[PDB]
């Protein structure tokens, strides 16, 4: 019942659970489908933080216990095997952050003893790099994403229990980690946790949670600062979220405070905890099963997604530009905003006239006269003048004189001839039709209306037309209201400076569309960023998790290629997903023309798949056709040279049989702690002992000894 951490996998399909009773539970999440599979045990104290690994390095888990030991788990052929244990911390290891796959396979450890060791993953077994940390202990560590696109196949911030943080940078000059710039006194009490933003932007955001205060440092190419919100229980854990640059803060209040960013500079808000926002746009709570989906709150996007797809299909044809009347179609917003820039050039008092022509029809009903005024509020004054011609006597003589230039009707008509009186959606239009004309101005009406509503109550609440017509006078930003018309407003008129904020708003809307069970439009909008590295990396990883959930036929792939995405990242990411899922899985990357070294390292998977000869022959033919780049082709051709000796059967050596023997021996010597590979080469060695002489290629003690004892007999 006392769980301290719950970590989602890279796909959001397998849940990792730690505990206090020395138990590491593994669940299989498929929405609400909770499927318990495997349970692990073997620690002295409570397990604090687990962490999944990037699928490019296989399914690996990193556990840190209260004892100070660090157990690195990994599954082998459908079964979990405890590989390596690293114990070099006098106190408990609180958190262990996972390194990005672009920076190899590292592992930062944070313990409250005085040091923070990073664990490099050698091809065979662990290599350790020891660094020093805060004297009063360390409770936090987080990796920083570098500037590089790579999928198949570097700094990190350390939090402090000494009421301070530090930022470690890699240094090959001494093969250690140097401290380039130290931050000073973020809080007053011990820092509980620190998290680096995975979102790639022009700046790097760092979250620091402690004294019930929270710092959020914005690290531009300069000195970062923060605005500590005095929210007052203690905040223990903070998890970032690549779903709109979201910041989840978690302390002891039986709830998780979610934080989003505003363009002003402030952040709007939407025993242990240990939450972790899944990269599949999902927040995980610790009751113990949590699966809360977090996304931006707005009017339903299916219509907007239809319009957006209509925009993509009408713009993406080669290899872009945001138009107005080319993607306006049915929605009145586009058509209104398009002619709104021109000072009533394309018949502004006619469109709204049509709007009230479809609106006032319900107001003229059940109105016995009064319908004259109700129609006067409408654009047309003909029916108004007619109803005032019916009764009201000479009042008409004024009304018709108003359309050319002791009673509530008389008061309203007189007031309108020169306040609003009542309230409606046509109120602004009514004020626009009878405050202008004397000078034929639109900006004056909008401004006067703005001042009036600044001095009134309940006026124009939650509307798109609000921001639309307010955008004319003082062309800037106000509130949220699609981002297509925003970029369209950026192209022509106007919101100076904040271009990178437009980048962040387009990224926010990108992740918003990505969380709406869609990948292709998300892939398009993510491909519409300012920076090159940012767009490349974002699209790459997003296509990773997209192809994770993308076949060769047109219905998906041609929809992913029509956007303009190269056929390199898609298949590479797809095969990246396929790695954690088969030997025929790497075939995809093989004919993806994006393998290179991966195709050379695919033999590692071809190995345990010989268990069946023609297939291996064909794959080896594929590897034979590609003689490109280590590129140990001579030692890699052994897989092709095996069915040769297998089908050979005793008439003389091939004069290349000794070459495949030397290759098999070199492979058997180079192949490290892989039992599958050794057993495979041993089996395929025994297979060619019954055929030829087979003096080398002897591995295991029992088979070699006994078979040699039986053959020499």
């Amino acid at each position: 019942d006392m769980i301290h951490d719950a970590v989602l996998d890279y796909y959001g399909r397998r849940l990792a659970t730690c505990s206090s009773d020395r138990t590491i539970k593994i669940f299989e999440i498929e929405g609400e489908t909770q499927r318990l599979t495997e349970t692990l045990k073997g620690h002295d104290g409570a397990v604090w933080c687990v962490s999944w690994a990037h699928p490019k390095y296989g399914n690996i888990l990193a556990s840190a216990g209260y004892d100070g030991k660090v157990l690195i788990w990994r599954e082998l052929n459908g079964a979990w095997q405890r590989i390596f244990d690293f114990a070099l911390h006098k106190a408990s290891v609180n958190v262990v952050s996972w390194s990005p796959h672009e920076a190899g396979c590292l592992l930062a450890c944070a313990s409250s003893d005085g040091n923070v060791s990073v664990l490099e993953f050698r091809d065979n077994s662990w290599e350790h790099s020891i660094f020093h940390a805060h004297g009063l202990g360390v409770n936090s560590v987080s990796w920083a994403p570098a500037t590089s696109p790579g999928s198949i196949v570097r700094r990190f911030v350390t939090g402090g229990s000494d009421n301070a943080l530090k930022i470690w940078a890699y240094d090959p000059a001494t093969n250690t980690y140097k401290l380039e710039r130290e931050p000073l006194t973020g809080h007053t009490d011990w820092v509980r946790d620190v998290a680096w933003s995975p979102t790639v932007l022009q700046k790097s955001y760092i979250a620091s949670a402690s004294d019930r205060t929270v710092r959020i440092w914005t690290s531009d190419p300069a000195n970062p600062l923060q605005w500590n919100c005095k929210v007052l229980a203690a905040v223990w854990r903070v998890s970032w979220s690549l779903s709109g640059n979201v910041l989840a803060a978690s302390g002891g209040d039986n709830k998780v405070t979610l934080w989003k960013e505003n363009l002003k500079g402030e952040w709007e808000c939407v025993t242990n905890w240990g939450p972790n926002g899944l990269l599949v746009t999902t927040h995980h709570g610790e009751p113990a099963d949590g699966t809360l989906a977090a996304s931006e709150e707005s009017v339903g996007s299916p219509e907007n997604l239809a319009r957006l797809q209509r925009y993509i299909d009408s713009v993406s044809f080669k290899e872009a530009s945001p138009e107005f009347r080319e993607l306006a179609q049915g929605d009145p917003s586009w058509e209104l905003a398009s002619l709104l820039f021109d000072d009533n050039g394309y018949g502004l008092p006619a469109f709204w006239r049509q709007l009230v022509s479809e609106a006032t029809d319900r107001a003229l009903a059940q109105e016995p006269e009064e319908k004259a005024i109700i129609c006067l509020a409408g654009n047309r004054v003909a029916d108004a003048c007619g109803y005032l011609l019916a009764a009201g006597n000479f009042r008409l003589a004024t009304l018709v004189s108003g359309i050319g230039m002791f009673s509530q009707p008389v008061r309203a008509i007189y007031e309108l001839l020169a306040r609003f009186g009542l309230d409606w959606m046509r109120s602004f239009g009514l004020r626009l039709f009878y405050t202008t004309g004397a000078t034929a101005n639109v900006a004056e009406a909008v401004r006067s209306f703005q001042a009036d509503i600044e001095q009134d109550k309940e006026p124009e609440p939650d509307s798109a037309l609000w921001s639309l017509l307010k955008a004319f006078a003082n062309q800037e930003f106000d509130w949220s209201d699609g981002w297509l018309l925003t970029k369209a407003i950026y192209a022509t008129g106007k919101g100076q400076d904040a271009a990178e904020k437009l980048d962040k708003a387009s990224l926010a809307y990108a992740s918003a569309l990505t969380a709406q069970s869609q990948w292709v439009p998300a892939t398009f909008v993510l491909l519409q960023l300012s920076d090159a590295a940012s767009r490349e990396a974002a699209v790459r990883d997003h296509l990773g998790r997209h192809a994770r959930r993308p076949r060769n036929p047109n219905s998906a792939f041609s929809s992913l290629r029509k956007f303009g995405v190269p056929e390199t990242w898609i298949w590479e990411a797809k095969a990246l997903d396929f790695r954690a899922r088969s030997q025929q899985e790497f075939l995809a990357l093989v004919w993806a023309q994006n393998y290179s070294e991966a195709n050379q390292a695919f033999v590692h998977r071809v190995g345990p798949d010989l268990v069946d000869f023609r297939r291996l022959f064909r794959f080896a033919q594929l590897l034979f056709k590609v003689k490109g780049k280590q590129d140990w082709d001579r030692g890699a051709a052994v897989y092709l040279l095996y069915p040769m000796a297998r089908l050979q059967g005793q008439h003389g050596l091939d004069k290349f049989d000794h070459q495949l023997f030397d290759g098999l021996v070199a492979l058997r010597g180079q192949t490290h702690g892989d039992i599958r590979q050794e057993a495979a080469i041993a089996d395929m060695a025994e297979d060619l002992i019954r055929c030829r002489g087979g003096d080398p290629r002897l591995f295991g003690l029992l088979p070699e000894d006994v078979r040699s004892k039986y053959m020499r007999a």
Partner: protein, 195 residues
């Protein structure tokens, strides 16, 4: 028909001499018969006496061929483990695994649990890197097509000619590991505890 009379005339007592008759012999197919008799009578006696490993290979394949009959009272397989305890511990574990697979496809506790226990016994008996166990569309078209697509893009020529010759010459195993069966047993116990 003669082999029956031969094996009947063998009359195996404390011999140390019939082995000479085994190394003197064209086809030792009658051995399978005498062994069978030796298995029908008092057993384990053939564990005790063994001429040579090279000759023991024959009787090994013989008893193994007597295990594939799925003849439950399996009998010989147990024996087949015992001999494979003296040498080839791995093979003993493998045959015991095959055994567990046979029993699982046909009380159950005392057999399965003991089989897995002896399996981990032979597992720890055998050093690492030796837990190797046998335990017996429209994609290839893309393979060939893209092969023909990349071959147009790109003494070795003799190797390619040979490769083509063996290409014209052209037209079930498992992998039980340490933690594989170690987890399989835990899963079986978990399934038994879920009853």
């Amino acid at each position: 028909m003669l082999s029956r009379l031969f094996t009947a005339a063998t009359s195996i007592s404390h011999f140390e001499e019939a082995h000479s008759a085994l190394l003197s012999m064209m086809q030792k197919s009658y051995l399978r018969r005498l062994v069978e008799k030796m298995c029908e009578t008092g057993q384990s006696s053939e564990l005790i006496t063994l001429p040579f490993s090279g000759l023991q290979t024959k009787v090994d394949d013989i008893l193994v061929e007597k295990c594939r009959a799925t003849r439950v009272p399996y009998h010989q397989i147990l024996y087949a483990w015992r001999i494979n305890h003296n040498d080839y511990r791995g093979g003993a574990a493998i045959l015991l695994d095959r055994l567990q697979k046979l029993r699982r496809a046909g009380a159950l506790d005392t057999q399965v649990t003991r089989q897995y226990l002896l399996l981990i016994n032979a597992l720890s008996c055998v050093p690492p890197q030796e837990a190797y166990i046998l335990e017996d569309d429209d994609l290839e078209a893309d393979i060939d097509e893209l092969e023909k697509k990349l071959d147009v893009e790109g003494e070795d020529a003799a190797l390619i000619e040979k490769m083509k010759r063996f290409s014209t010459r052209n037209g079930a195993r498992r992998l039980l590991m340490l933690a594989d069966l170690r987890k399989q047993y835990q899963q079986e116990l978990d399934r038994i505890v879920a009853i």
